[PDB]
């Protein structure tokens, strides 16, 4: 039971989880400046936070 | 019509935050709320 259920700290899903959808100081996520990712999040109005 | 509305500060329900200093206006989809001191 210990060896089977010894789950890791899991991972992060796409851009939907609260761990990433709303920021926290400890968490740091970023992309490359002046790229398509930059003008994908900037263009969207829901992904302004 | 125009009417006054009161709001407290709760965690997921109403989150208050300071205005953006780089422009003087806060983000979109975030209505202003005056605070008295």
Polypeptide structure, described:
The structure is cut from a larger assembly and holds chains A (about 50 residues) and B (about 35 residues). Chain A has helices at about 20, 40. By secondary structure, chain A is mainly α. In chain A, about 0% of the residues are buried. Chain B is about 0% helix and about 0% strand. Chain B has no helices and no strands. Chain B is mostly loops and about 35 residues long. Chains A and B meet through loops of A and loops of B.
N-to-C span of chain A: 41 Å
Quaternary assembly: part of a larger assembly
Biggest beta-sheet profile of chain A:
none
> Which shape of chain A, going by the Cα principal axes?
elongated
Q: From N to C, what is the helix and strand string of chain A?
A: HH
Task: Tell me what portion of residues of chain B adopts beta-strand conformation.
Answer: under 5%
Q: Give the biggest sheet of chain B.
A: none
Summarize the largest interface: chains and residue counts.
A-B, 4 and 3 residues
How many beta-strand elements of chain B?
0
Family (chain B): Belongs to the glutamate-gated ion channel (TC 1.A.10.1) family. NR2B/GRIN2B subfamily.
Organism (chain B): Homo sapiens (Human)
Protein name (chain B): Glutamate receptor ionotropic, NMDA 2B
Subcellular location (chain B): Cell membrane; Postsynaptic cell membrane; Cell projection, Dendrite; Late endosome
Write a concise synopsis of the structure shown.
Chain B: This is Glutamate receptor ionotropic, NMDA 2B. The structure is cut from a larger assembly and holds chains A (49 residues) and B (37 residues). Chain A has 49 residues and is mainly α.
List the topology elements:
The structure is cut from a larger assembly and holds chains A (49 residues) and B (37 residues).
Chain A: H1 18-21, H2 38-41
Chain B: no helix or strand
Keywords, separated by commas or semicolons:
part of a larger assembly, 2 chains, A: 49 residues, mainly alpha, 2 helices, elongated, B: 37 residues, little secondary structure, 0% helix, globular, Glutamate receptor ionotropic, NMDA 1 (chain A), Glutamate receptor ionotropic, NMDA 2B (chain B)
């Amino acid at each position: 039971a210990f060896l089977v259920l010894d789950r890791p700290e899991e991972r992060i899903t796409g851009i939907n989880d609260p761990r990433l959808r709303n920021p926290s100081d400890k968490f740091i996520y970023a992309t490359v400046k002046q790229s398509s990712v930059d003008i994908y999040f900037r263009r969207q109005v829901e992904l302004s936070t | 019509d125009h009417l006054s509305i009161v709001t407290l500060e709760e965690a997921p329900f109403v989150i208050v935050e300071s205005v953006d200093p780089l422009s003087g206006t806060c983000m979109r989809n975030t209505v202003p709320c005056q605070k008295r001191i």
